[PDB]
Paper text:
To further expand the toolkit of available phototoxic proteins we have very recently come up with a blue-shifted KillerRed variant carrying tryptophan-based chromophore (substitutions: Gly3Cys, Tyr66Trp, Asp113Ser, Asn145Ser, Phe177Leu, Tyr221His, Glu236Gln) named [name]. We also constructed monomeric mKillerOrange by introduction of the single Tyr66Trp substitution in SuperNova, a monomeric variant of KillerRed. The principal structural fold of the monomer in [name]/mKillerOrange, shared with all members of the GFP family, is an 11-stranded β-barrel having loops from both sides and the chromophore (matured from Gln65-Trp66-Gly67 sequence) embedded in the middle of the internal α-helix wound around the β-barrel axis.
The crystal asymmetric unit of [name] contains two dimers and one monomer forming a dimer with the symmetry related subunit, while the crystal asymmetric unit of mKillerOrange contains one monomer. The dimeric structure of [name] comprises two monomers related by a non-crystallographic 2-fold symmetry axis that are positioned at an angle of ~120° relative to each other. The contact area (~1400 Å2 per monomer) between the subunits is stabilized by symmetry related van der Waals contacts, two weak hydrogen bonds between the side chain of His148 (A/D) and the carbonyl of Glu146 (D/A), and two strong peripheral salt bridges between Glu99 (A/D) and Arg158 (D/A). In [name] dimer, the irregular C-terminal tail (residues 224–230) sticks to the surface of the interacting subunits, contributing to the interface stabilization. A continuous chain of seven hydrogen-bonded water molecules in the channel covers the distance of ~20 Å from catalytic Glu218 in the chromophore area to Pro192 at the bottom of β-barrel. The side chain of Trp66 of the chromophore in [name] and mKillerOrange adopts an unusual trans-cis conformation, not seen for other Trp-based chromophores before. Ile199Lys replacement in [name] resulted in ~25 nm blue shift of absorption band maxima accompanied by significant decrease of the protein phototoxicity and raise of cyan emission, presumably due to isomerization of Trp66 from dominant trans-cis to minor cis-cis conformation.
Numbering used by the authors:
A (entry chain D): 1 to 64, 68 to 230
B (entry chain A): 1 to 64, 68 to 236
The structure:
């Protein structure tokens, strides 16, 4: 009644604080955005606070809101079920022939705004590769795969791909776990998919290092077949 | 001058010979099946010729026909394009907390029958885990991801999941390269997806160790989004 989805029936906002490093160099991001009900198509503005981000903004796409994915009736929406107590996320994305980003995320809801703090360590990145040299152009869509992971968690597996300036491709491997903070016995959804489409663009309003990003996310399932 | 999808406009059949080992134990499988036009929903019957298969049939699912996936107009069908010259597959499926299968596949078309030979090494498997103990029940659907891979290849990435006998899960990681065995310049499709749904049942006619398997496979794409609702770019 006033937990889970019931708390996502109106328009909402969110705010994010990221504390990071890449190959030793530190950085800080703050961001804010919003999601109109019925959700699933939303936007975020982000800025680097410490000056110029020392790596492509593109791999940050997934740090700058699973509870704003839209779920149809018939599939339990774990990330929305986690409230009001909140949730955490532990995530690794490993880039082929390049480095790995490991992040930890906390989410709290107050009123109609969800606040996140994230620490991320980006290590082993190649100084000459497209990430450190800012040569990533588009973000490919993903059909991310979701699985139940014990009584209090769900796991997300994905292939996250980026096109490059010379017309090629860089592949990332995402493995992510969402854990409910409370003791309450929420419904763990069974195996399903979440389709995620993303478009990041530089905001040349300010002379600050800042980007706008839009996301469409929608969960679905696939039927069995008989013999 | 007959090639690619032109060669797939009728009902077809296929035959597979698999030469495998799992943890040093050699085995042999032979399969056959058919696919009716317009393809995308098709069957196979397989049998272990060396007696009793020493592992679960479940992970053999993807060894026992990409060219029978159904593609919509607007997405080039790489596996069909590779004919008449033929198709090779190199593939690895690594299972979490368990072993890795490494396969080499070669496919050739004679008439309306696609013949294939596969070699597969299944190594590092756990003798007490659910593959070696035959405790896998269902095959989860996958939203496989396809990508261009140079001028003569495509790469498939997937997660292949199985349910177990006590109601849990076993996850596999699949990485597969399809290569065209010819020199003509064929179209390499852009990123897209192939949904695959699979159902395997033991066939309990006769004493021989065999299974029946049905697969539904369809390609789809996902569109781009513009920077806001109602714009363009």
């Amino acid at each position: 009644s006033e937990c889970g989805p019931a708390l996502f029936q109106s328009d909402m906002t969110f705010k994010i604080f990221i504390d990071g490093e890449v190959n030793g160099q530190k950085f800080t991001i703050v961001a804010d955005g919003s999601s109109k009900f019925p959700h699933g198509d939303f936007n975020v503005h982000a800025v680097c606070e410490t000056g110029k981000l020392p790596m492509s903004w593109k791999p940050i796409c997934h740090l700058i809101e699973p509870f704003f994915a839209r779920y149809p009736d018939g599939i339990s929406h774990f990330a929305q079920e986690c409230f009001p107590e909140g949730l955490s996320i532990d995530r690794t994305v490993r880039f082929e022939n390049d480095g790995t980003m490991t992040s930890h995320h906390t989410y709290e809801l107050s009123d109609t705004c969800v606040v996140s703090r994230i620490t991320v360590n980006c290590d082993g990145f190649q100084p000459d590769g497209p990430i450190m040299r800012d040569q990533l152009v588009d973000i490919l869509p993903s059909e991310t795969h979701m699985f139940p992971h014990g009584p209090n968690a769900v796991r997300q597996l994905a292939f996250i791909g980026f096109t490059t300036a010379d017309g090629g491709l860089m592949m990332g491997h995402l493995d992510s776990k969402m854990t409910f903070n409370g003791s309450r016995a929420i419904e763990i959804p069974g195996p399903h998919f979440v389709t995620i489409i993303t478009k990041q663009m530089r905001d040349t309003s300010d002379k600050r290092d800042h980007v706008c990003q839009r996301e469409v996310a929608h969960a679905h399932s696939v039927p069995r077949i008989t013999s």
